[PDB]
Amino acid sequence: PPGPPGPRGPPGPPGVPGPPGPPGYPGPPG
Amino acid sequence: PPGPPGPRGPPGPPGVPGPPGPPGYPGPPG
Amino acid sequence: PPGPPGPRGPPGPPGVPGPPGPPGYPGPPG
């Protein structure tokens, strides 16, 4: 009958880059 | 002959942090 | 004998959102 399963495979690739952050705060009064 | 391939590896690390957001809106008029 | 290593894991989660962008420019003069 078949031999034992092999070792676990390696870790996956990193996820995709995160989303751009939100807009910054409004500038100061002119 | 060799047994079955091992189990699939774990999920990878998180992706790189996202870029900084767009510049904020201009301030109010002086 | 034991099988070959398993397949590579799935991708990690998406990166975190970036930080808020730079502050806006100063408003126009009154």
Author numbering:
A (entry chain A), B (entry chain B), C (entry chain C): 1 to 30
Reproduce text from the manuscript describing this model.
Collagen's structure involves the assembly of three polyproline II helices, with each individual chain consisting of a three residue repeat sequence with the general form (Glycine–Xaa–Yaa). Within collagen's trademark triple-helical structure, three polyproline II helices are stitched together by a network of interstrand hydrogen bonding along the central axis of the right-handed triple helix. The triple helix is stabilized by the backbone NH groups of the Gly residues acting as hydrogen bond donors to the carbonyl oxygen of Xaa position residues in neighboring chains. To gain atomic level insight into these new rules we present two high-resolution crystal structures of collagen triple helices, with the first peptoid-containing collagen peptide structure.
We solved the structure of CMP 24, bearing the Xaa position Val residue, with the sequence [H–(POG)2(PRG)(POG)2(VOG)(POG)2(BrF–OG)(POG)–NH2] to 1.25 Å resolution. For one CMP we included a 4-bromophenylalanine (BrF) residue for phasing using single-wavelength anomalous diffraction, but molecular replacement was successful for both structures. In the structure with the Xaa position Val residue, a void is present along the surface of the triple helix at the site of Val incorporation. This is a result of Val's secondary backbone amine being sterically unencumbered compared to the tertiary backbone amine of N-substituted residues like Pro, Hyp, or peptoids. The consequence of this hole is solvent exposure, clearly indicated the presence of a water molecule next to the Val residues in our structure. This water molecule is well-positioned to hydrogen bond with the NH group of the Val residue at approximately 3.0 Å away. Importantly, this water is also positioned in close proximity with the Cα of the Gly residue adjacent to the Xaa Val approximately 3.3 Å away. This Gly Cα corresponds to the azGly substitution site in our model system. In addition, we have reported two new collagen crystal structures, with the first structure of a collagen triple helix containing a peptoid residue. These structures, containing either a Val or NmetG residue in the Xaa position and reveal how the NmetG residues protect the collagen backbone from solvent while the Val residues expose it.
